[PDB]
Design a protein around this ligand. Structure first.
Ligand SMILES: Nc1ncnc2c1ncn2[C@@H]1O[C@H](COP(=O)(O)OP(=O)(O)NP(=O)(O)O)[C@@H](O)[C@H]1O
Ligand SMILES: Nc1ncnc2c1ncn2[C@@H]1O[C@H](COP(=O)(O)OP(=O)(O)O)[C@@H](O)[C@H]1O
Ligand SMILES: [Mg+2]
Ligand SMILES: [Mg+2]
Lengths: 55, 487, 458, 128, 458
């Protein structure tokens, strides 16, 4: 019963681990967006304060 | 050369004047009515000045007289119980100014060799700060954090704990809301601390020049005590609101803006303001008239307050102030919302004076907490996966959780350096290790604290002397062993 | 008395030669295509010229026409005579009854009350809202602020506050919509005229449809009324829609007024423009002012200057986040980033405090676990943390409740919760009493005894 | 009336604004971009019997006209919290989010409930 | 021979008769009543006019004031006459002692030493701190960077480097306190006189509160002193207190001078400023000037331009750690991240490079073992592993040591250790003879010879 439950563990694990790998992949896609947004905001402000500052 | 001048243009609290050929930098300039302005921008054939007050009544053509010296202010022992303006005008209510002499708002800080190495403590009352981010006379700790992390609460609470220590206090409210300020001093009165602290004020509606100058004015008032062999504690609430006001001025004066449109000399602004605060050697006996002995030493401790937006601690103003102060207490909004009330974040915080600005017994028993806290910092990651780890490191985690659960106090409840007993011998043995669970790990605090008031002669002793060796340790060991025969 | 020299949008400057250079804040008129056009002096520019701002469409102004200068700053009526109906930023009767109006008159530009003349109390008033009453209360003579991006129920929230406290009021109210939709104002007037409650209120409307000048001044014409009512009768309510619309107006102008831009293109005078107006609203020794106001937050950025600086001027600061709305909780208050200066134990009693901070804690502890859950699933939490999220998710949706005013566009009938019950329920859930019940039992209900009965149906 | 892409308008206005040298703000848009859309959408409304009478000069003598208006805003990557989109949402008394992924998966009237709203609500519908 | 025309902050500009007018970087004297403050020409804009920066406070200055055109750039006393006390940006003494003994009076301004200087040069300056010598060997003409946040011990570590190189060898030390704190400037001067070290250490302070133009040049001044000691043919050291405050102060200058900002708002010349300051510091044919400079990292971000442009010039980098310090180790350096462009075998001998990498290796393996030790306990490690961990634990404490300048803190006696004692220590402690003694023996000691002694007391 133990030795069999153990073989169930290895499966359920490698399966539930593939899930965790795919969950992480989804977060990485969402983050990449949040990033690209800040990447733009950052570059517009730096450019704007320099040029408007010069005036 | 000419003494007088006339107003060519007036807008946004700034005046551009023609003529006035004889005029110095930062020099006062009397306008019609009683109010003055400040000559900050003397270009050729025109001098821009900042109106120190309302500017609506002013107009074109008005004769504007040059004057003698710069901005001065009422300073002395008399201001203590009073709430004062930036100019020293009592909006308090009492009315008359019991002031002694005048002093310049802008004035150089004591150079080297005039300084004495800081080594005496100023107790904030908080177990958290006094033990691992110690402060001392002549120091400058930067309280910094996001909105609503408990900055001011820490500040005035440190002021309230000087209600009895002999240090005089100053509170420079800048850009604040009037309704709020009255609330503050109202509580400075509920505790005996108001009769011991002058509160300078520059409400959110006052001129840009008034807010921008508020800190310096409140400084000259505090400098008074240090120059005469005494200790004082000034706290500039919202040094952020100050720089935003000075930014308003420099922009209206058409000065080149740096990052975030802030003036290039913003660092220089806070720089000279903060170097003002320091401890000065007893040989400052040579004063306004050397010198009514005056064998004593003097100092001026100042903890400014920066407000960060969204934790952005690399922003322009914060970057400057952090670089200046010899120490800074970072308050995290995450620690706060959780329950850790003194939202101080160790490891990131710092006090370059450290052990020096700390009582003898604290210096010894705080060393145990500093490392016990530091190890909990390393294992914090495993807290999610707790119970996965063997008892060896599991116990270090529990000790850490408890010791951080110990470093948290109610707002208006400063500790007695009997906090020493609590903190110290929280580390000595797991007197917390028994009966840990964190729920009780605090109710034990308020219980050890008051069963010592049972036999407190051996306690006010440790309080006054501010020292410990071994007997006192031995006694302490037994006081806790004797403790758990109660509750 | 003088003539136009330039015209750039709302900003027009007038030449007046020396004799009568208009005082800085002062009115003056102009005949355009047809009717009267009030300009307000803003800057005494050098050379006898003067910058002003059109209190109406600047379109149709010639480059040379004459303009008369008067000595009156701004002509706005005050007193019981105003209670009747709606007003302009200029103090004109915008509604269809030629005003009987003023026994007196004040300028829209005023000074902030003297420091020692400022009062304060701790008599907490009770809104119907469960979130607000528990998470952030306020005494009369308070400054409440509703922060929120677009479409987070910003308006409907204020209107529900109004209907709840404008009843316990028994006094004089002064609503002052600024930069809002006109459609809401019309409904608010008609809705309030049928309930017959207009005779104790007082309207003033500067729309988001009207030119810049009207907006940044209508906020002033609004409270200068509440100020009169204050310096006589003691208890007044002051509701303001979008203080942001006022600051925003000042930005559209700051460029033409010829000053360098501050951070993010805002005016360098943002610090003061806010403070002046915001410092005006306060409890005087002679009479107090209770006031809620909808402070807009641009692009959801709570770091954006308008919100950032506005914060300090508020006693209680409740903030609505889009994330909480995207769920279904439609008093979309973020119970974590929302606070009050009076959530004090000595003020609101210990039971309210401990309950508030207890609810605050477990809700925050949940935000931390939220990360590991999303990556590794629920089954990885300890049986204790498991219970933490479960109890939290109950709280998270017991915060919700249907508003009466919101019945129109949602089937759900409204409800009103006692400040007493709000404590009973949350304290209760936290103790672990109502666990067995499913989550949906708590979503969108009044007192806890409603969560119970809803659990029966499902 | 339906204004197709107020996003394409705002970007066109930003062009002229910057050519005129007007100081940019958030996302480089002129500070008055809200007023741009505001005074436009505010035009759309329902006028009561008296207004129509006064305008018509007594010819209509008792009717209410109205200009219903539903504008279009093109978001980038579902970023609804962008500057222009937020303003137009702040103006209009309701909105209709067409979700990008609901649309891909056959649900063609991609309207996203629970987020889409009509604040006028009940009154706006027939009895049945 | 000229008159102030405009004055803004420290940006006073003066007019002259055309031809003759001041070269750039030229000095200018001017009275403002109390005292004469100096000006440095920065831009020769327009005809006859000249933009400058006040070396002191520009307050009190007024239009039309007489500005005396001096001939040379900044003037500063050099030679052994300087060694012995403090002195501000421009030579003059601030210690209230006598006046500078003598001066050839060099200019603070520069010239890159032509690439005719005597590398090859491996003289492996022994500090000698165990860890800063075992892990970070550096040669004359080289420059070492001390990286870390606040409170890690950059400055105090410099104090030790000064005292050791001073008394255990020949002094030869110039300390440039660029924008240095006043409190630090005091404790430094006191601590330096407490020990015999004060000579040779010529101090050059530029207090924080001094204007930007002042703090910028403070580096070049202290540089020019050591710049002459190398001319005398001696191997001097130079401690610049903060490379950060150098670039940052240089930022303020460029700012109010009107230059267009660049990366993060830094001056558009940040690269060249750092270029000249760093380039004259080398080993010439005649002598050499070695440098150790504290590189502060803002927000602990190495991408920030300040520490970024610094990296290109360092021959070795000693990273300190706020967390290492917390755990009690006070020569608080991370052996794993501290590097040296010189730490290869044929430069520093095999024995050195081997035991160096070995300490690195073992410290690393412990890090890997540390993971399994928490999860499944210490009992799981093989006998060889739990031997590696015990042996590693020991070397960790061994490379900490009581500084001499640290006695004001700890009270224990400081101790100087050779390079050969250190290697002889670490090599053995890991081979490993001293397995029979408890960790604490290695906690704070000189060579293991002392560790074995303390081990007897145990
Ligand atoms: N040690 C504490 N225990 C319990 N409550 C506290 C404690 N410290 C602060 N608070 C509460 O935290 C709230 C805010 O504290 P406060 O000191 O005003 O933060 P602040 O950062 O100055 N916020 P603000 O200045 O308005 O941006 C207050 O309601 C305090 O009562
Ligand atoms: N050997 C030591 N013992 C005790 N404290 C030390 C030791 N070395 C450095 N410190 C601590 O470092 C702190 C600050 O030193 P400092 O070098 O100036 O920090 P930073 O390098 O960030 O400027 C001091 O308060 C001091 O206590
Ligand atoms: Mg505060
Ligand atoms: Mg330092």
């Amino acid at each position: 019963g133990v030795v069999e439950n153990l073989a169930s563990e290895q499966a359920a694990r490698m399966v539930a681990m593939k899930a965790a790998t795919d969950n992480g992949g989804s977060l990485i896609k969402e983050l990449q967006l949040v990033y690209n947004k800040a990447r733009q905001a950052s570059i517009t402000q730096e450019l704007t304060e320099i040029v408007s500052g010069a005036a | 050369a000419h003494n007088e001048g006339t107003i060519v243009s007036v807008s946004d609290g700034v005046i551009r004047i023609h003529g006035l050929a004889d005029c110095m930098q930062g020099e006062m300039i009397s306008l019609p009515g009683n109010r003055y302005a400040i000559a900050l921008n003397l270009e050729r054939d025109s001098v821009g000045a900042v109106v120190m007050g309302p500017y609506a009544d002013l107009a074109e053509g008005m004769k504007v007289k040059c004057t003698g010296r710069i901005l001065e202010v009422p300073v002395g022992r008399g201001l203590l119980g009073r709430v004062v303006n930036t100019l020293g005008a009592p909006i308090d209510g009492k009315g008359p100014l019991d002031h002694d002499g005048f002093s310049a708002v802008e004035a150089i800080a004591p150079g080297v060799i005039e300084r004495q190495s800081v080594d005496q403590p100023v107790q904030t009352g908080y177990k958290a700060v006094d033990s691992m981010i110690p402060i001392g006379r002549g120091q400058r700790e930067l309280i910094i954090g996001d909105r609503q992390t408990g900055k001011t609460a820490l500040a005035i609470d440190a002021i309230i704990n000087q209600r009895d220590s002999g240090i005089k206090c100053i509170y420079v409210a800048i850009g604040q809301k009037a309704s709020t300020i009255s609330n503050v001093v109202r509580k400075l009165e509920e505790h005996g601390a108001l009769a011991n602290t002058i509160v300078v004020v520059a409400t959110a509606s006052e001129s840009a020049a008034l807010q921008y100058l508020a800190p310096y004015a409140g400084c000259a008032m505090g400098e008074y005590f240090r120059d005469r062999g005494e200790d004082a504690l000034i706290i500039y609430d919202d040094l952020s609101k100050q720089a935003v006001a000075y930014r308003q001025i420099s922009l209206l004066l058409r000065r080149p803006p740096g990052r975030e449109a802030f003036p290039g000399d913003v660092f220089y602004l806070h720089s000279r303001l903060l170097e003002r605060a320091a401890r000065v050697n007893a040989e400052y006996v040579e004063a306004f008239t050397k010198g009514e002995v005056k064998g004593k030493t003097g100092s001026l401790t100042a903890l400014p307050i920066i407000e960060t937006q969204a934790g952005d601690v690399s922003a322009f103003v914060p970057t400057n102030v952090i670089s200046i102060t010899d120490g800074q207490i970072f308050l995290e909004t995450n620690l706060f919302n959780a329950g850790i009330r003194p939202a101080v974040n160790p490891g990131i915080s710092v006090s370059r004076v450290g052990g020096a600005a700390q009582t003898k017994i604290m210096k010894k028993l705080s060393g145990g907490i500093r490392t016990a806290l530091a190890q909990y910092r390393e294992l914090a990651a495993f807290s999610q996966f707790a119970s996965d780890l063997d008892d060896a490191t599991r116990k270090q985690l529990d000790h850490g959780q408890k010791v951080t659960e110990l470093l948290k106090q109610k707002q208006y409840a400063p500790m007695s350096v009997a906090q020493q007993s609590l903190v110290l011998f929280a580390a000595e043995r797991g007197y917390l290790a028994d009966v840990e669970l964190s729920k009780i790990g605090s109710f034990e605090a308020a219980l050890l604290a008051y069963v010592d008031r049972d036999h407190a002669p051996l306690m006010q002793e440790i309080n006054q002397t501010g020292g410990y060796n071994d007997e006192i340790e031995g006694k302490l060991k037994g006081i806790l062993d004797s403790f758990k025969a109660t509750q | 008395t003088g003539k136009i020299v330039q015209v750039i949008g709302a900003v027009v400057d007038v030449e007046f030669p020396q004799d009568a250079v208009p005082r800085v804040y002062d009115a003056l008129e102009v005949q355009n295509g047809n009717e009267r056009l009030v300009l307000e002096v803003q800057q005494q520019l050098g050379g006898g010229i003067v910058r002003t701002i059109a209190m109406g469409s600047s379109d149709g102004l010639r480059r040379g026409l004459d303009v008369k200068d008067l000595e009156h700053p701004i002509e706005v009526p005050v007193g019981e005579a105003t209670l009747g109906r709606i007003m302009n930023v200029l103090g004109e009767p915008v509604d269809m009854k030629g005003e009987i109006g003023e026994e007196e008159r004040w300028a829209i530009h005023r000074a902030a009350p003297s420091y020692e003349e400022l009062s304060n109390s701790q008599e907490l008033l009770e809104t119907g809202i469960k979130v607000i009453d528990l998470m952030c209360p306020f005494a009369k003579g308070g400054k409440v602020g509703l922060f929120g991006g677009a479409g987070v129920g910003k308006t409907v929230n204020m209107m529900e506050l109004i209907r709840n406290i404008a009843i316990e009021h028994s006094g004089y109210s002064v609503f002052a919509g600024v930069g809002e939709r006109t459609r809401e104002g019309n409904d608010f007037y008609h809705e309030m005229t049928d309930s017959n409650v207009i005779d104790k209120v007082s309207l003033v409307y500067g729309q988001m449809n009207e030119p810049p000048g009207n907006r940044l001044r209508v906020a002033l014409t609004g409270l200068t009324m509440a100020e009169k009512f204050r310096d006589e009768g003691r208890d007044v309510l002051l509701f303001v829609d979008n203080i942001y619309r006022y600051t925003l107006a000042g930005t559209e102008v700051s460029a033409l007024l010829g000053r360098m831009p501050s951070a993010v293109g805002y005016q360098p005078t943002l610090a003061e423009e806010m403070g002046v107006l915001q410092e005006r609203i306060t409890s005087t020794k002679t009479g107090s002012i209770t006031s809620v106001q909808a402070v807009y937050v641009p692009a959801d950025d709570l770091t954006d200057p308008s919100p950032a600086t506005t914060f300090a001027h508020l006693d209680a600061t409740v903030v609505l986040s889009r994330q909480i709305a995207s769920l279904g909780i439609y008093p979309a208050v973020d119970p974590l980033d929302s606070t009050s200066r009076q959530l004090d134990p000595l003020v609101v009693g210990q039971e309210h405090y401990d309950t508030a901070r207890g609810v605050q804690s477990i809700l925050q502890r949940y935000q931390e676990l939220k990360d590991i859950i999303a990556i590794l699933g629920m089954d990885e939490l300890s049986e204790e943390d498991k219970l933490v999220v479960a109890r939290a998710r109950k709280i998270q949706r017991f915060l919700s409740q249907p508003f009466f005013v919101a019945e129109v566009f949602t089937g759900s009938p409204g409800k009103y919760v006692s400040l007493k019950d709000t404590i009973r329920g949350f304290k209760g859930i936290m103790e672990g009493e109502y666990d067995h019940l499913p989550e949906q039992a708590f979503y969108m209900v009044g007192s806890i005894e409603e969560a119970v009965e809803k659990a029966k149906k499902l």
